[PDB]
Design a protein around this nucleic acid. Sequence first.
DNA 1: TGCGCTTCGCGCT
Length: 183
Amino acid sequence: RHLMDPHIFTSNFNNGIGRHKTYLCYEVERLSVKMDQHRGFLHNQAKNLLCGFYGRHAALRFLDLVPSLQLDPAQIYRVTWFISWSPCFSWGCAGEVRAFLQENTHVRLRIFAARIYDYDPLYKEALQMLRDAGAQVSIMTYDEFKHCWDTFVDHQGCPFQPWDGLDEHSQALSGRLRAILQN
DNA sequence: TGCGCTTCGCGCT
Ligand SMILES: O=P(O)(O)O[C@H]1[C@H](OP(=O)(O)O)[C@@H](OP(=O)(O)O)[C@H](OP(=O)(O)O)[C@@H](OP(=O)(O)O)[C@H]1OP(=O)(O)O
Ligand SMILES: [Cl-]
């Protein structure tokens, strides 16, 4: 019901040029594997040192609203994240997501990242930790960009229009993420 | 608040 401005989407999910914030689109489906129950998007709480606030990453904001999703513990769910920056360890979700997957075995998590957030020195260990805890960790391709536009954006009937370099950036980042997860 | 560049801000205003 709450949809994203087209400009916000294309300025934040471009897999070639970064932004100083993170958006996260999310979908919950009930598993004989077909039921689409809760959808939305959110961004990080910006760091604001004038109020002495060190910020809250978008993935941690997703964990904050899980209670409000009212997932029935008698059902199995798949949670999908479309995140403009890969999750990280430092000030990140990696540890709390690991904890959240350990204590909630009825939840499967799938994470598609537009870009790799390597500004965290431990970003490799973060991605490896999420995989160890049974999360699927992937790079957004054309299919994921288009699904996100079709589902989360106020497109007003305008079909998704790929930016220049979309497939090239996707392949390069897929290469990097595979070398990280090979280890 | 808005700007200009843009790695979950910064450093001006
Ligand atoms: O593959 P189909 O079962 O024939 O239906 C697909 C499929 O629908 P859903 O995403 O709703 O399940 C696409 O996504 P995939 O499952 O193939 O990944 C979807 O694309 P969007 O999610 O981007 O909307 C696309 O929708 P459309 O063509 O109406 O834009 C639609 O049709 P196509 O397979 O003909 O592309
Ligand atoms: Cl994170």
